[PDB]
Enzyme design. Structure first.
Site, PDB file in Angstrom:
ATOM      1  N   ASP A 100      -0.633  -6.895 -23.156  1.00 33.81           N
ATOM      2  CA  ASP A 100       0.235  -8.059 -23.044  1.00 33.81           C
ATOM      3  C   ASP A 100       1.264  -8.328 -24.144  1.00 33.81           C
ATOM      4  O   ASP A 100       2.254  -9.051 -23.960  1.00 33.81           O
ATOM      5  CB  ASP A 100      -0.647  -9.296 -22.904  1.00 33.81           C
ATOM      6  CG  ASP A 100      -1.792  -9.406 -23.897  1.00 33.81           C
ATOM      7  OD1 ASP A 100      -2.569 -10.313 -23.773  1.00 33.81           O
ATOM      8  OD2 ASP A 100      -1.977  -8.599 -24.797  1.00 33.81           O
ATOM      9  N   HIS A 101       1.073  -7.740 -25.286  1.00 36.17           N
ATOM     10  CA  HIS A 101       1.937  -8.004 -26.413  1.00 36.17           C
ATOM     11  C   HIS A 101       3.154  -7.094 -26.570  1.00 36.17           C
ATOM     12  O   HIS A 101       4.079  -7.458 -27.291  1.00 36.17           O
ATOM     13  CB  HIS A 101       1.051  -7.975 -27.663  1.00 36.17           C
ATOM     14  CG  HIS A 101       0.186  -9.227 -27.832  1.00 36.17           C
ATOM     15  ND1 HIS A 101      -0.671  -9.839 -27.024  1.00 36.17           N
ATOM     16  CD2 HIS A 101       0.288 -10.045 -28.913  1.00 36.17           C
ATOM     17  CE1 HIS A 101      -1.058 -10.968 -27.544  1.00 36.17           C
ATOM     18  NE2 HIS A 101      -0.471 -11.073 -28.695  1.00 36.17           N
ATOM     19  N   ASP A 165      -7.579 -11.859 -31.516  1.00 35.52           N
ATOM     20  CA  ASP A 165      -6.484 -12.771 -31.201  1.00 35.52           C
ATOM     21  C   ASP A 165      -6.918 -14.190 -31.569  1.00 35.52           C
ATOM     22  O   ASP A 165      -8.018 -14.613 -31.219  1.00 35.52           O
ATOM     23  CB  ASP A 165      -6.159 -12.736 -29.695  1.00 35.52           C
ATOM     24  CG  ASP A 165      -4.825 -13.332 -29.342  1.00 35.52           C
ATOM     25  OD1 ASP A 165      -3.832 -12.632 -29.377  1.00 35.52           O
ATOM     26  OD2 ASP A 165      -4.790 -14.512 -29.025  1.00 35.52           O
ATOM     27  N   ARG A 447       1.989 -22.418 -30.565  1.00 37.05           N
ATOM     28  CA  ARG A 447       2.592 -22.322 -31.894  1.00 37.05           C
ATOM     29  C   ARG A 447       4.140 -22.521 -31.887  1.00 37.05           C
ATOM     30  O   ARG A 447       4.856 -22.013 -31.005  1.00 37.05           O
ATOM     31  CB  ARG A 447       2.098 -20.930 -32.409  1.00 37.05           C
ATOM     32  CG  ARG A 447       2.804 -20.268 -33.608  1.00 37.05           C
ATOM     33  CD  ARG A 447       1.980 -19.295 -34.520  1.00 37.05           C
ATOM     34  NE  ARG A 447       0.821 -19.998 -35.027  1.00 37.05           N
ATOM     35  CZ  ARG A 447       0.542 -20.313 -36.305  1.00 37.05           C
ATOM     36  NH1 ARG A 447       1.275 -19.940 -37.413  1.00 37.05           N
ATOM     37  NH2 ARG A 447      -0.532 -21.103 -36.416  1.00 37.05           N
ATOM     38  N   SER A 642      -1.835 -16.129 -37.245  1.00 38.63           N
ATOM     39  CA  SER A 642      -2.161 -15.019 -36.396  1.00 38.63           C
ATOM     40  C   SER A 642      -3.243 -14.136 -36.997  1.00 38.63           C
ATOM     41  O   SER A 642      -3.265 -13.979 -38.229  1.00 38.63           O
ATOM     42  CB  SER A 642      -0.851 -14.300 -36.141  1.00 38.63           C
ATOM     43  OG  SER A 642       0.027 -15.279 -35.543  1.00 38.63           O
ATOM     44  N   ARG A 644      -3.961 -10.722 -36.958  1.00 37.38           N
ATOM     45  CA  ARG A 644      -3.748  -9.358 -37.389  1.00 37.38           C
ATOM     46  C   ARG A 644      -4.392  -8.906 -38.694  1.00 37.38           C
ATOM     47  O   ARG A 644      -4.057  -9.405 -39.771  1.00 37.38           O
ATOM     48  CB  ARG A 644      -2.213  -9.116 -37.418  1.00 37.38           C
ATOM     49  CG  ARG A 644      -1.390 -10.003 -38.358  1.00 37.38           C
ATOM     50  CD  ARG A 644       0.102 -10.245 -38.048  1.00 37.38           C
ATOM     51  NE  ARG A 644       0.343 -10.931 -36.795  1.00 37.38           N
ATOM     52  CZ  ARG A 644       1.439 -11.682 -36.525  1.00 37.38           C
ATOM     53  NH1 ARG A 644       2.450 -11.785 -37.405  1.00 37.38           N
ATOM     54  NH2 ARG A 644       1.499 -12.289 -35.333  1.00 37.38           N
TER      55      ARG A 644
END
Ligand SMILES: O=C(O)CC(CC(=O)O)C(=O)O
Ligand code: F3S
Length: 754
Positions: A100-101, A165, A447, A642, A644
């Site tokens: 999806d990203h 996520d 966000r 986020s 990551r």
């Protein structure tokens, strides 16, 4: 279990264990002698050793056993590369990859997806053959966003799910504890070892009264986000309860849990109820709803449980809110926003109106927006503003397309984007604005941090509900107030928009569409996953250096950071998502957005030996290849945002040893402990002011690093004076063993053939 009900239709062999949940809740309960809250029944029901686990809120690390792992493709690539290094043959629990990203929004639906599968074949092909190989389910690009597919198929009441996520809390709308983690946490559960979590504090938000009018689910967390602020939920789980819960739909509760990420909460949850039952049955899981009815005492909070903070919200007094523009906690009534916008200087005409994503794309949301559109269409109106719609999954796209809603939405002027994040992570080729243009966009997303959506430092973005985005999109201005104002219709009369009227869930059944998922073959003894040696998108990891037994003396400060330093300042997204599987190629973005306190600017720090100001990655690389070890100094809530792990790997890859701040965000501090770095905080936050860019630091006391002992830090000033400060850390002995080994992966490898 006695009952034999499966976890989902994709794992028919893997059964729901509420019998174990209950046995561990009964073991805990009698050790604790007190009522437990819902998130305590579910977290403590998944402990690996409930008889012995030490339990104290905000103090102990719980060693837990998650039910399933879900991964998104921008973080799945590095998580699967760490799993590939473990050498382990298959994943220990149900895991899925969702694509999806990496799909950029440019022309719309079909064209954008075609281009993304061409542009990204290497990475999609890597993720599917590693999925096939290691037994991970793979949702194909175009199939939908991770949290929407998890709500439609894999979340159920009582589940403990972890996902790579931050918006993984979304799952709390179906009664489960869904926590976001960095990829190395996911590889612990996939490797089959216990997952550790700092025992949460519990905030109780009590809901009273009912939703009415323009007020939706979204409004409750825009209201709560402004009450608690971004710092508000750190270290706690928000638990929603009251008579008012049952006035919200299951997908509305998921909207509320999702944005709880934005206040720093470990996750958010709602207690099982009739709305969840209804959604479970309408999404092909009536049997799960029948099992759950039988175990309902364990999926609601005990009577009289104690929340560490209670917030009460009267839903009947609640009115529409629009939050922003640069944080999700600057909260506004949609009645006031026009006003504030003119006194504050925010651009009044709405350039782009964007609805959807996983936060606000249920069948109810798409329909309530259409119910507004249909009205404007009956008066020959169309969106004054540009208008985009992102469906959350191929099932919501096929279903709303079939029931008509998608055609109303295009007829007012909206373009339907591919079922992927797109503009929500800022994956968007924007055109209506020159960069630097000051302009207002309004989204139904979560966000609205600076530069999140188009990387325009000056685009002012406001988050609200899809129906209010739709109403303000036809209006074209933040001046309009849907519930009061009149609109001038093509036939010259005045009329006012009626508050949306819409079905919660389809009268019919849901259309799933075709070709969404790749099953793993318990077959292919002979799947082969091949990173091309000189691939610029994917690179196999090479172990980090084991700790050298010595203390960390005369360390350089690469950058002393002023203010807020989010993981987007540390590892940006936008163009760098194409390197999420290549560590040295994505490291070239290290800390380029953080503000240097020496000159107030991003990406220009002074190189201690050449005395030239220049890019941070270049400087950290200069330091590394010259044998200089460095440190970062931060202010508050460092690594906010986020999930990551690239925020932690890239410091390690370029010569970084420690990050010392006044406080850390949860997922970022776990990610630094996981990569062998040292997350340390000031025992006195005022000591931040003692350290200047020029000083050298010695972190002393590692040889007897212990839980609870502070570490001593000697600041060495150019003029020979030194100062010694104390630094705290939240490492327990599991985590000190990760530091000692060089990273947590190195340690996992020592419990096999060393
Ligand atoms: O202060 C800490 O030790 C960590 C944080 C966040 C967490 O991991 O839950 C906290 O306990 O508040
Ligand atoms: S997971 Fe959801 S919060 Fe946005 S970046 Fe994707 S639509």
């Amino acid at each position: 279990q006695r009952a034999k009900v499966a976890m989902s239709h994709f794992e028919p062999h893997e059964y729901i264990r509420y019998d174990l949940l209950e046995k561990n809740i009964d073991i805990v309960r009698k050790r604790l002698n007190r009522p437990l809250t819902l998130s305590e029944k579910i977290v403590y029901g998944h402990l690996d050793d409930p008889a012995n686990q030490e339990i104290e809120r905000g103090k102990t690390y719980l060693r837990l056993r998650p039910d399933r792992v879900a991964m998104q493709d921008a973080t799945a690539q590095m998580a699967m590369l760490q799993f590939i290094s473990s050498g382990l043959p298959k994943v220990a629990v149900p895991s899925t990859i969702h694509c999806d990203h990496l799909i950029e929004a440019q022309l719309g639906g079909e064209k954008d997806l075609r281009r993304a599968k061409d542009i990204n074949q290497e990475v999609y092909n890597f993720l599917a053959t590693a999925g096939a190989k290691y037994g991970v389910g793979f949702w194909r690009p175009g199939s939908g966003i991770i949290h929407q597919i998890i709500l439609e198929n894999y979340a159920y009441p009582g589940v403990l799910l972890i996902g790579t996520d931050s918006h993984t809390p979304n799952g709390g709308g179906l009664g489960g504890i869904c926590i976001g983690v960095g990829g190395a946490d996911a590889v612990d559960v996939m490797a089959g070892i216990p997952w550790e979590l700092k025992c949460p504090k519990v905030i109780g938000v009590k809901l009273t009264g009912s939703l009415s009018g323009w007020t939706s689910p979204k409004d409750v967390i825009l209201k709560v986000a402004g009450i608690l602020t971004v710092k508000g939920g750190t270290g706690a789980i928000v638990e929603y309860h009251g008579p008012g819960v049952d006035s919200i739909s299951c997908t509305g509760m998921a909207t509320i849990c999702n944005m709880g990420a934005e206040i720093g909460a470990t996750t958010s949850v709602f207690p099982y109820n009739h709305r969840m039952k209804k959604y479970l049955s309408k999404t092909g899981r009536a049997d799960i709803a029948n099992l759950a009815d039988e175990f309902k005492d364990h999926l609601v909070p005990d009577p009289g449980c104690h929340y560490d903070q209670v917030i009460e919200i009267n839903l009947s007094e609640l009115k529409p809110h629009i939050n922003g523009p640069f944080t999700p906690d600057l909260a506004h009534p949609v009645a006031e926003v026009g006003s504030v916008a003119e006194k504050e200087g925010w651009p009044l005409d709405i350039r782009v109106g964007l609805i959807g994503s996983c936060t606000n794309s249920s069948y109810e949301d798409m329909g309530r927006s259409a119910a507004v559109a249909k009205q404007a269409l009956a008066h020959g109106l169309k969106c004054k503003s540009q208008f985009t719609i992102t469906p959350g999954s191929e099932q919501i796209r096929a279903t709303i397309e079939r029931d008509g809603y998608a055609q109303v939405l295009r007829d007012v002027g909206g373009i339907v984007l591919a079922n992927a994040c797109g503009p929500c992570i800022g994956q968007w080729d924007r055109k209506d604005i020159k960069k630097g243009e000051k302009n207002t966009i309004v989204t139904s997303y979560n966000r609205n941090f600076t530069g999140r959506n188009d990387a325009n430092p000056e685009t002012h973005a406001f988050v609200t509900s899809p129906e209010i985005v739709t109403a303000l999109a036809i209006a074209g201005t933040l001046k309009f107030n849907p519930e009061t104002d009149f609109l001038t219709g093509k036939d010259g009369k005045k009329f006012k928009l009626e508050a949306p009227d819409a079905d919660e869930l389809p009268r019919a059944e849901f259309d799933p569409g075709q070709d969404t998922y790749q099953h793993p073959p318990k077959d292919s003894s002979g799947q082969r996953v091949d990173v091309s040696p000189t691939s610029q998108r994917l690179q196999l990891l090479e172990p980090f250096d084991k700790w050298d037994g010595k203390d960390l003396e005369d360390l350089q400060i690469l950058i002393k950071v002023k203010g807020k330093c989010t993981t987007d300042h540390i590892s940006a997204a936008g163009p760098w998502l194409k390197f999420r599987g290549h560590l040295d190629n994505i490291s070239n973005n290290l800390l380029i957005g953080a503000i240097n306190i020496e000159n107030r600017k991003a990406n220009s720090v002074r190189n201690a030996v050449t005395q030239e100001f220049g890019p941070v990655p270049d400087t950290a690389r200069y330091y590394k290849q010259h044998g200089i070890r460095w440190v970062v100094i931060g202010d508050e809530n460092y690594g906010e945002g986020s999930s990551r792990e690239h925020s932690a790997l890239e410091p390690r890859h370029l010569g970084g040893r420690a990050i010392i701040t006044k406080s850390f965000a949860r997922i970022h501090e776990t990610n630094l402990k996981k990569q062998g770095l040292l997350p340390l905080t000031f025992a006195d936050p005022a000591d931040y002011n003692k350290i200047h860019p020029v000083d050298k630091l010695t972190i002393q006391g590692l040889k007897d690093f212990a839980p609870g002992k502070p570490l001593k830090c000697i600041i060495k000033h150019p003029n020979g004076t030194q100062e010694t400060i104390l630094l705290n850390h939240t490492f327990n002995e599991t985590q000190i063993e990760w530091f000692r080994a060089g990273s947590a992966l190195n340690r996992m490898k020592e419990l096999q053939q060393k």
